[PDB]
Design a protein around this nucleic acid. Structure first.
Length: 57
RNA sequence: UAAAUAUUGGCGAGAGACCGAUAGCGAACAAGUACAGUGAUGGAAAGAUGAAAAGAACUUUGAAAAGAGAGUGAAAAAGUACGUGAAAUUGUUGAAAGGGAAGGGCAUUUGAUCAGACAUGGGCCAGCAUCAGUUUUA
RNA sequence: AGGAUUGCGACUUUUGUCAAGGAUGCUGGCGUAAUGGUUAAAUGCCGCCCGUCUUGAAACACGGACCAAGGAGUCUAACGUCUAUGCGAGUGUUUGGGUGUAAAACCCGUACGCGUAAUGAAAGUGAACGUAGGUGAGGGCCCGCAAGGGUGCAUCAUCGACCGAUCCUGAUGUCUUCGGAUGGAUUUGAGUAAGAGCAUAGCUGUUGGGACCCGAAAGAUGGUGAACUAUGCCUGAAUA
RNA sequence: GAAAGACUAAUCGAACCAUCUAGUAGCUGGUUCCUGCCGAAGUUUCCCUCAGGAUAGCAGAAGCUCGUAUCAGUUUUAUGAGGUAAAGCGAAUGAUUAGAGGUACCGGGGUUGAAAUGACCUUGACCUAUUCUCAAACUUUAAAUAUGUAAGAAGUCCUUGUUGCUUAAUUGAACGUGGACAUUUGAAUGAAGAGCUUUUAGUGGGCCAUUUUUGGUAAGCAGAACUGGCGAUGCGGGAUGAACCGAACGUGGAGUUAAGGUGCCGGAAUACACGCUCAUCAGACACCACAAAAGGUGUUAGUUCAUCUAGACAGCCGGACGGUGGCCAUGGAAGUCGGAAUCCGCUAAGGAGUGUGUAACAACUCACCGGCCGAAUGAACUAGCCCUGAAAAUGGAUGGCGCUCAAGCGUGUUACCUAUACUCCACCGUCAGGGUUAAUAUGAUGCCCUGACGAGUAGGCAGGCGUGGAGGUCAGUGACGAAGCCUAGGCUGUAAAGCUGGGUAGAACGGCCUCUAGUGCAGAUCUUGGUGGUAGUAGCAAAUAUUCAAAUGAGAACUUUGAAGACUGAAGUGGGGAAAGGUUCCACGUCAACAGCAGUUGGACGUGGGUUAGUCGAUCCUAAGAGAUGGGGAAGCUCC
RNA sequence: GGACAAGGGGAAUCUGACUGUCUAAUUAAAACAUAGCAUUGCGAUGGUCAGAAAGUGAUGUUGACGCAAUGUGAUUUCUGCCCAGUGCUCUGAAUGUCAAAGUGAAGAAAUUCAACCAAGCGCGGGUAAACGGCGGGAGUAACUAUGACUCUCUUAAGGUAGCCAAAUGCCUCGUCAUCUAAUUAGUGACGCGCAUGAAUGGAUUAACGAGAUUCCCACUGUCCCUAUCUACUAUCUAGCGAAACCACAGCCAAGGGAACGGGCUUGGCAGAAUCAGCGGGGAAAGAAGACCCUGUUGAGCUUGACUCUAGUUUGACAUU
RNA sequence: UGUCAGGUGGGGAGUUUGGCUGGGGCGGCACAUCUGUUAAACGAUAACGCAGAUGUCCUAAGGGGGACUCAUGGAGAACAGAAAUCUCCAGUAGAACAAAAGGGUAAAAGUCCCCUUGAUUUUGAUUUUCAGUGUGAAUACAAACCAUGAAAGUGUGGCCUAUCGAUCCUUUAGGUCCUCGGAAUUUGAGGCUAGAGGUGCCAGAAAAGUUACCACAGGGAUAACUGGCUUGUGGCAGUCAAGCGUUCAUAGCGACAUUGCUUUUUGAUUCUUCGAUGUCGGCUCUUCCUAUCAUACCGAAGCAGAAUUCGGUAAGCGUUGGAUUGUUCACCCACUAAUAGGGAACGUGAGCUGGGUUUAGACCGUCGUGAGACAGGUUAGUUUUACCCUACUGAUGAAUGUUAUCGCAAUAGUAAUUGAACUUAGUACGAGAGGAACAGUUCAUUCGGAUAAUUGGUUUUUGCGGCUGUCUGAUCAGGCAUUGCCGCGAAGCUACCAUCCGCUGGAUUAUGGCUGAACGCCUCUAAGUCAGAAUCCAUGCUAGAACGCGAUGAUUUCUU
RNA sequence: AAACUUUCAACAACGGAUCUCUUGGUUCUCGCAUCGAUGAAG
């Protein structure tokens, strides 16, 4: 007796509000990245902080 | 074993941004009355003439009720079927229309009726000419 | 349409003139029911009866004979976002006391609620390596004639630091089994990082309440009926 | 309960009376004043979910950080992915028609000397090269249309820092320090400002159209895909119609067109040009309201083939034999039951023969050729409009009348009619972008300028109109007339409404700034009260029956008296009581209502009068029953 | 029997014996009752039944020729077979199971694990005028049906006497005979009978029946075929005077449309005001469909549905 | 007797007794999942669409390394054979891989041989269904600890796509852990971190029937009656023509194929109506359709005549009486000119009937433990209201100067019907048997309009006469018996139960002809034209427009 | 042409809305404790 499924006035609804791109940023989210790489990457950024501090003198 | 605490009942006093007679208690009036049911119980409607009854003497028509006059009063378009007296709904008179309904909207014509700055000394309705804006036709 | 002038122009020998940022000039009739307004009828064309549930109503779908008055999202206890007001690391007088022109207005302060610290089931412990850290963007201001450089609040992204839990590591010491130094980890929190909240009032939304208004077949507690009719007992009557 | 779920005070498959109770409802019906701006959904996932909720989506409101940004339901250049339409089977997988060859090593049936470790037959057994047709769940190959990424300052290269990662390493990899290159911000077009956050309404039954498409004989049937509509939407056209064609709407004026039309109804050519059709059932405009196979010398055009200086068809006559009865067959076949031969002569021409006919001949007749006559005819086909095929029920529908070298059908060329669409001007509102008290009176909320837009149910927000009370203020209005009510009088506002003339009537009531609510009605088989049409209508008909005079009275079909007719017929319309009523009995007065006509009468209305017991009843005794006490239960009302 | 008053009759079939009784206001019967027949329980400290409880009740002013609880339904005549299943019952054999209290062992105690164990269920016997079933399913063959032997499926047994297309038979309007001109009817026979059958009573049957059904005699306006008469209405007048219903109203055909218009569209047409009749329409009035489906709405009845319970019965402790 | 424990206990109490669904119910699972396709060349995508699978099996069929090639065919080897084992040649997979189906794999992911437990531990990130929640599965690393190989490497179960499960409760593993809040010690209980015990309605209540005695709230979101769309099925008709028909396709028939029409069969569907449109037949009455049974007039025949068969224009006119059944339909017995088929809300219930279906009473059989059920059989069972509007049938009537006579006819309606006898004639025709017709006479059938002299019926003429019972004293003469009964009975009314009456011209259809082109002939025809049928139109009959007309008669006092 | 039907106005009917009034209600606060065998409530 009842109607099952349809896709009428569905794409028409979506284009009213937007259909938008996902923004994008500089410095993306560093998640799901290799753990061995990240540990060494932390020590590199710690060491280079000492370098720039000594230069400004 | 007192006090600070309770109280839609009873007796006595104050108030209200509460209702205004289809409201407010069921009940502003002879209301738990009239009335219904065998019985437990059920349960209405109904306020207002005028300051004062001064509540209409007397004539005349009628078997009488009443009617016409008169008289009271500021008023009887206040007469105890009573302040004001709306609508549905009815009678009379006046105006209009009517060949299987009426009743509406736009625009005129005729018939009715009605506002609005010519008064001081004794505005309304058109026509022609030269221009501007938009068009049409040789 | 507009209602002093301002502009662009053109023609001018020149002054000025002009069709150039929206109509001026001249003339006649009437000055009132004539023009207009409402109202009734006639004529041309057009017009199905509202309210409602529905994909769909003029409907052979439901409610409506007619009129008057009454008649339906209200108030409260906890609350959320937004907005106005007062004070602001605080805020809130009104349980209660003092006073009074007496349910008012005015004054008073111990407490107590929320906020100022979190995270763990709990025992418990408990937020600065550095200008409260770097990088990218950033309004505004500063220097400069400009090009450009300097300083960069709010906020957004991003990698670090700190506090708690979790899992390892286990220093000097020491009731020899307590104690937890320091260093770490693809884990983890409604955290810290120069505080924002508390009180009153308003629209809208939420949950309990009769809960926008009317509407069941039922269920439960405590009572009244055998003058009708069902059946038995006692005592009478009636049938050519 | 002699049994039917019967009866139990009009109530029974579980009585009635109050209270808990305003019981609960995913279900039905109703839900009260105006303009202004924006404007939906019937879909995804879960649910004792399918008439219902949550969750996302769509919508409004409030805005915040910024001011041409790194954006777009689009195109182009560069570059990826796909297995549909078509295509293919002498290409796999599976299906399938017809021969030919190789046969050879072989499985078999025969025929040939029972013969065959031998031939030739149908043969398989496959094989070899060919040939006809196929496929949603087969494929080598392979479009269109849709679809992913890129077209730069977060850029391209040069330098040298950082470490516990990585390297044989002085390598690499990430994140950097300083440096070079801005006209030419390194395709097109547009930009109505861009990005972001909170919060909450309605909705969660959908339906129709053009293509794609599954089930089904098919359906105004069921079910999907992509855009567009209706629902929420008027306006011009399709006669009429939710959806089709054209177009989307503030209030008016002038022009011009869309779709569709121009004999009349009806505004606009009884225009112009070339054809076709005549129907005793003509035809007439998309979706749309129907028609087919098969046929016609009705008429119109065309294709392919034939004969033509006598056509040849006509269309009327002349011939149609000689060998010959050809061989064969057998009762007999002589052109004519048949099986094959198909040849000559004379020839203008005559088949060893088209049929009729006969037992077989005879006889007739064509094929082919002359005789008469003098210019185009014969066959087979294709499509146009008309006709046959074509039968349903009340009378009937190209919208109607009517139309025939059309007012019909096909095609062309011009004019003309006309929508709320398009262009231009007036006025209204909403939104945006500006300019301004620099003393310079009257509202800075002011006073101006410029530009765009206007449909709308469910829904949300904004700005106003009115009703009952409260605080303030106009030293407001009023018995010289407040409130209310009536009025084919007038004025203002888009409107909710407000102000005011005339009449009626006789005590209170308004404006402006704020507070507050039992604050606006046409619907609910709404509640209470009142009044209509229907209508002076339905009807006032069962118990056999009334009539004549006289009196009283305003008045007599109906009261009182007389006379005459009648009935009940003593199980009665007679004479007395029981239950039950309660003054109805009786007298005098008297008719406003009641006695469904009337009324002088009355069981009506007003004012009085009336029931006398030692013996008649009650009182007294006991019946079926009821019911204290002594006792025993029960928290107790009270029970035995 | 001159008015008045006053039985129609006959031959059958189904069914209940009869007289009697009930659904008050749609069912008067074939239903219920009944005499007769049969079964079950009880010797008073008892059976059946009431009450919240009692030093309390009904049967009972009773005592088995009685009281209580059921089935069948006068007389004549018969009541066949089957205790596997489901009930009921027993002086059946036990130890298969099986509560609290008590008994013992372990432990520091709370607890724990052991045997021991009442009725009642399991195990065995009895019972069909207890509830019920009494079917077929296969085959062997004498002769061209033959009815004697075997087994065994759902458990135990396999329809005996009887009766029938019967109120019990689907296929059907069965086949044969009879009644009629003609019979889906009626009666009489036949019977592997979907699904007859023995006190859940079978077969028969005199009298009786506002019971159901078929035919024959007499009788007739039921009918061919209608006609006429009488009273009381209707009709007209005087007086009195309502209700239902009602958006607005009232002429048709076709079209399209929520697919059957009184209003929209195109045609036909169209003349004040009215009175008797009548039943074609107004999808005419009556009543928020009783049939059907939905609702996470109910109630009445039933049962090896789920969870309880009064009563009763067995055991332990107290009264002791 | 009291308290506690075990059995029994529909005697009574409370409550439930799924969902989807071309109505529901019975079936089935489309209700958690997986393969191919439908699905329209990215992804997404429906139906109780199509072909099929799963609730498991495995210490090896898991993990690593090393050997080696399978289907099938051909040629050879004692028993040995189409098929045992042995050897060589060809061999792109045509095999095998735990199962459904698709993909994948050849010094392997197949087959055989050696060693083992990566089916291990601690936790997060990530794809797929998706609210970007959970459940299930799958992918890529970090820190560990192992296996295997000379190593590089590979391995966090099954080559890949399926093979499974919250809260609360119970239970097991783990730790020199935390808590029992007056302080301690041992038992005991409660916590923190990961497994197991299951919800198949699979995001997860704990649950049997029946109601014909029924109830409420709703639903045309949804069945039973019409109507509409559709036509498979039912019914009626075409096309081509192998054969049948002694001979001969089409006088009449007609296989194998194929195009249609119709809504009087039955299905399909669910748009209208559930705050009700009164559902089966019969009785009564009107009108419409033609797909014609009869009658009128014609054509064809395997038509001699009679009878019959096929077709044409035709709906003018007619279509019956009975037995059985509730019947529609059916089947018989007759008659007849003939006993054709249908529609109108499956015409017709405020028109009737109530036998049927269809409520409650009751009986029988089969089924059910039981209440009860049965598209089985049987018997008894309630049929309301018109006074309104239109419609039809009759009847009055204002107003056109007033009144009265005598007429015309617009339009509407219309009617006649069929047979038998005598004669023609026992003639035509025919071997016979049989056996017509036109004209001409007389009568009937069904239908219609009047009429009452006669016959019949009716009798309140209460006209006359008779008879009972009672009442008025008797006799005479009467009353009552709801018109007392009985016989005769005028007037009126009335009956195929009685009598009379019911017209004749024109134009056409089918069809058959004349003259005659097209097409030098022929031809019923194209132009023109003769006959012709129950058809049509007049004549005749019925009403007379109340808004259609005409002709004629008389037209008002002396208060003025 | 009248009657009849429908719409409006003036006067007259029907009926009791509207407007103004009010010895009654309703809520809140404050004070006090008094039935009966001497025969109460009803």
């Amino acid at each position: 007796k009842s109607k099952n499924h349809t896709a009428h006035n569905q794409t028409k609804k979506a284009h009213r509000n937007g259909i938008k791109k996902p923004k994008t940023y500089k410095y993306p989210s560093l998640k799901g990245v290799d753990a061995k790489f990240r540990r060494n990457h932390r020590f590199a950024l710690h060491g280079t902080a000492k370098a720039l501090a000594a230069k400004r003198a």
